[PDB]
Amino acid sequence: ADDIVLKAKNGDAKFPHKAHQKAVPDCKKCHEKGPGKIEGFGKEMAHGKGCKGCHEEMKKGPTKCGECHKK
Ligand code: HEC
Ligand code: HEC
Ligand code: HEC
Ligand SMILES: C[C@H](CCC(=O)O)[C@H]1CC[C@H]2[C@@H]3CC[C@@H]4C[C@H](O)CC[C@]4(C)[C@H]3C[C@H](O)[C@]12C
């Protein structure tokens, strides 16, 4: 399947799966979650544990605005 881009108004936020499959061998961090995760994602999640928060916790991945968001 293809990578997806989240259409944030301030700039497209791409999600490259291959890098994540490699750097996050604990697949259950994102997969096999209960229901609601598709409906639940948004800016709050993205800037929290959904994206940015994991990068901070794992000490790796983009944590600056212009690193995730790109027009
Ligand atoms: C969140 C950070 C994820 C982690 C960690 C892993 N996966 Fe993932 N996966 C995630 C998303 C949002 C998507 C759909 C959008 C996309 O970019 O593909 C997927 C997709 C998959 C797929 C389909 C891939 C393909 O057909 O190219 C598979 C088979 C899959 N994910 C499995 C997988 C495994 C085994 C992981 C751990 C090593 C893993 N994913 C991590 C989100 C995230
Ligand atoms: C852990 C559970 C993560 C979640 C949830 C998300 N990301 Fe992530 N990301 C994670 C790690 C450990 C890394 C380092 C990968 C590396 O090998 O350097 C990343 C990396 C990225 C990248 C850059 C990929 C690259 O080729 O350098 C991007 C652009 C990125 N992550 C974006 C991103 C977004 C938008 C997420 C939410 C939708 C997201 N990540 C979740 C760990 C985790
Ligand atoms: C990746 C790790 C991110 C970092 C670092 C920052 N942002 Fe972000 N942001 C990210 C995603 C994946 C999303 C989309 C959420 C969704 O609904 O899918 C967003 C969202 C925003 C928004 C709202 C955009 C909209 O609703 O159209 C804004 C205004 C925004 N982001 C700004 C922003 C700034 C200023 C940041 C640095 C301080 C920043 N983001 C960090 C992913 C990531
Ligand atoms: C559930 C995990 C991990 C975050 C968490 O613990 O909740 C998060 C990490 C990235 C999230 C995905 C980002 C891209 C998509 C955003 C859409 O608006 C809703 C579906 C997708 C596919 C999201 C589904 C789910 O919300 C994921 C996989």
Side-chain angles (χ1 to χ4, degrees), residues 1-43 45-71:
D2 294 307
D3 289 339
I4 47 179
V5 178
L6 303 170
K7 297 298 279 180
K9 289 164 191 170
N10 54 309
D12 286 349
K14 73 184 182 178
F15 175 74
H17 188 259
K18 181 176 175 166
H20 289 89
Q21 195 155 45
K22 178 166 190 175
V24 189
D26 185 18
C27 313
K28 287 195 74 179
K29 279 299 199 168
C30 299
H31 293 305
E32 291 193 292
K33 298 290 178 182
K37 285 307 180 172
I38 298 175
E39 292 167 271
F41 196 81
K43 172 175 174 292
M45 273 297 303
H47 291 179
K49 65 175 179 188
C51 302
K52 184 185 174 178
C54 175
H55 297 174
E56 296 174 318
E57 285 292 285
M58 297 191 64
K59 303 289 167 58
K60 192 192 231 285
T63 62
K64 310 291 181 53
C65 314
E67 293 182 331
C68 285
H69 293 285
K70 302 190 179 292
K71 281 188 164 190

